[PDB]
Design a protein around this ligand. Structure first.
Ligand SMILES: Cc1cc2nc3c(=O)[nH]c(=O)nc-3n(C[C@H](O)[C@H](O)[C@H](O)COP(=O)(O)OP(=O)(O)OC[C@H]3O[C@@H](n4cnc5c(N)ncnc54)[C@H](O)[C@@H]3O)c2cc1C
Length: 500
């Protein structure tokens, strides 16, 4: 008796999962011949390649527990294997007598390298490998091909390409396993009956004092619930216009399905299909790029450009990216990282990010502009690394692609438009409720200067219980000075890149 193995990496869901579906149907169409090991590998190597904060560790822990729970309802379970794939797969290929291995493809360079070696091993031991592109709606390879070998570098050209492509069939959950015995314990399982159990919170989250509020629980189950909750107001959905959603409402102004889409707890193909059903129903609706389907197409767009550039997450060696002489300033980077810039709107956002792991798109705009071309003139690579640690939805292609946009390094070139750290939040939160919540030490400043506490006299600062420089920091830079200097630095950068 040989084993069929589905390998979870992303695609942490039962629904719309062709690679996992196939394994299951094969076991049921040939009962008695197969064991089934759905596995997730706790790869220590990924830590040398990306930062993971406490909040995202908890989201992953919750996700694996849910996935194990969902698999048990199918007379299976999740087998979480600790170790490096390059060392894990040669062992289990033999100890399990693996016939077929399926997984969902991923375009990240670490994923490509790792998968190539696993496919070299699988070819050596005579193991059949079947891969499926189900993490995105469109296959970046096919988009690039249809555009004659280059990724479209504008959103509109990208849309024109994928409109001519076939939308995939969205699958349901696999059928329950018919008369399947629990596989026999292997070398590892026998010395430890729990060697493959889902990891507890205590095993994955080493810095539990950095956990914030538990607001967006991991798991396919929670992802499906949150999608359904979001789709209930078909009018909000159909008339959604991303630029008009607020960055600083106390409740999120968008869906917050991003962590679920990042891990594959929600199939983007399923989400796309549910959106298209509502739009069909609702003749007055928005269109890309501002619509909700337009937001899914932003995700596809960045995945497509990223798939063609292994150096997508850095400035050097990146075919898309303007070469800009970003400066080093550790103290400023530390202030921005910990929301101690002295600009309450910026600080409020960075503290929400650290505590909760999610901030609104335009809140990302505000803090990214401030760090890079706007104010601090610090490389977008540094902001990307901080976002990578703190975000639940940390996504190699999205995190990089949007930082390049926000810094005027690629895709976006109107660097003369600069967000004010004082004025931008006022449009949607003139009372400063957001600042009061995440910068509580300012909670007694009136609206007239909560965005600019340095315009309150010392007497008033003592009256509000928050003296600048003691209880809340002074501005680390003067926006009105540096943003004009940085515009000229950008123009000089753009001239140098144009001549080369
Ligand atoms: C500096 C910066 C860094 C970012 N880093 C990430 C990241 O690490 N991970 C991430 O998923 N998104 C990232 N984004 C894009 C965007 O901010 C988030 O996708 C969005 O805030 C998620 O909230 P939501 O789920 O409510 O989005 P909604 O408005 O509800 O959109 C639904 C889905 O569409 C996609 N989407 C929406 N906006 C964008 C966008 N601009 N680009 C690409 N896909 C988009 C996401 O899958 C999202 O879950 C970043 C943007 C900026 C400016």
């Amino acid at each position: 008796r040989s084993t069929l193995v589905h390998w979870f990496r992303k695609g942490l869901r039962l629904h719309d999962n062709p690679a996992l579906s196939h394994i299951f149907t094969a076991a049921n169409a040939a009962p008695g011949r197969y064991f089934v090991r759905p596995i997730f590998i706790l790869d220590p190597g990924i830590l040398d390649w990306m930062q993971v904060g406490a909040n995202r560790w908890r989201f992953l822990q919750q996700t694996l527990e849910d996935l194990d729970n969902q698999l048990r309802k199918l007379n299976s379970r999740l087998f979480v294997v600790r170790g490096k794939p390059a060392e894990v797969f040669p062992r289990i290929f033999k100890s399990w007598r693996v016939e077929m291995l399926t997984f969902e493809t991923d375009i990240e360079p670490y994923s490509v390298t790792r998968d190539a070696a696993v496919q070299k091993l699988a070819k050596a031991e005579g193991v059949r490998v079947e891969t499926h592109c189900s993490h995105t709606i469109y296959n970046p390879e096919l988009v690039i091909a249809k555009n004659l070998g280059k990724a479209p570098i504008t959103y509109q050209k990208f849309l024109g390409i994928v409109e001519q492509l076939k939308v995939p069939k969205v699958l349901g959950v696999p059928e329950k396993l018919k008369n399947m015995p629990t596989p026999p314990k292997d070398e590892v399982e026998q010395k430890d009956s729990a060697a493959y159990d889902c990891p507890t919170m205590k095993q994955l989250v080493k810095r539990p004092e950095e956990l914030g509020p538990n607001k967006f629980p991991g798991g396919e189950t929670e992802a499906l619930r949150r999608m359904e909750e979001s789709l209930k107001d078909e009018i909000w959905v159909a008339r959604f216009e991303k630029p008009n959603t607020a960055p600083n409402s106390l409740e999120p102004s968008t869906t917050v399905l991003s962590p679920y889409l990042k891990f594959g707890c929600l199939s983007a193909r399923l989400f796309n299909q549910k959106l298209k059903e509502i739009i069909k129903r609702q003749p007055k609706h928005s269109q890309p790029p501002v619509s909700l389907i337009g937001q899914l197409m932003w995700r596809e767009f960045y995945y497509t450009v990223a798939a063609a550039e292994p150096n997508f997450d850095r400035m050097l060696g990146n075919v898309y990216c303007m070469q800009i002489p970003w400066q080093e300033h550790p103290d400023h980077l530390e202030a921005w990282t910990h929301g101690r810039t002295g600009y309450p709107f910026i600080d409020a956002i960075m503290r929400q990010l650290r505590q909760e792991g999610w901030i609104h798109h335009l809140a990302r705009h505000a803090v990214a502009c401030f760090l890079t071309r706007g104010d601090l003139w610090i490389s977008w690579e540094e902001g990307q690394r901080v976002f990578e640690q703190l975000l639940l939805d940390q996504d190699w292609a999205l995190n990089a692609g949007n930082w390049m946009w926000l810094s005027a390094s690629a895709f976006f070139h109107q660097y003369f438009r600069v967000y004010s750290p004082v004025a931008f939040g006022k449009k949607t939160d003139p009372q400063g409720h957001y600042i009061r919540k995440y910068v509580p030490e300012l909670s007694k400043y009136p609206a007239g200067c909560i965005y600019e506490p340095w315009k309150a006299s010392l007497v008033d600062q003592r009256a509000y219980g928050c003296v600048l420089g003691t209880d809340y920091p002074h501005r680390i830079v003067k926006h009105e000075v540096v943003h004009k200097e940085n515009i000229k630095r950008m123009g000089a950068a753009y001239k140098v890149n144009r001549e080369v």
